[PDB]
């Protein structure tokens, strides 16, 4: 799973929500 180029309040990279997304978004740009 990418990594976001920047944090957002609405969006953060946390560990659990990159952790869920592997099996719901797993193929997600990181690119914004």
């Known amino acids: 799973v990418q990594t976001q180029d920047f944090k ?12 869920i997304k592997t099996y719901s978004n797993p193929k997600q740009r990181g690119d914004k």
């Open 8 to 19: 957002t309040a609405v969006q953060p990279d946390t560990n659990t929500a990159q952790l």
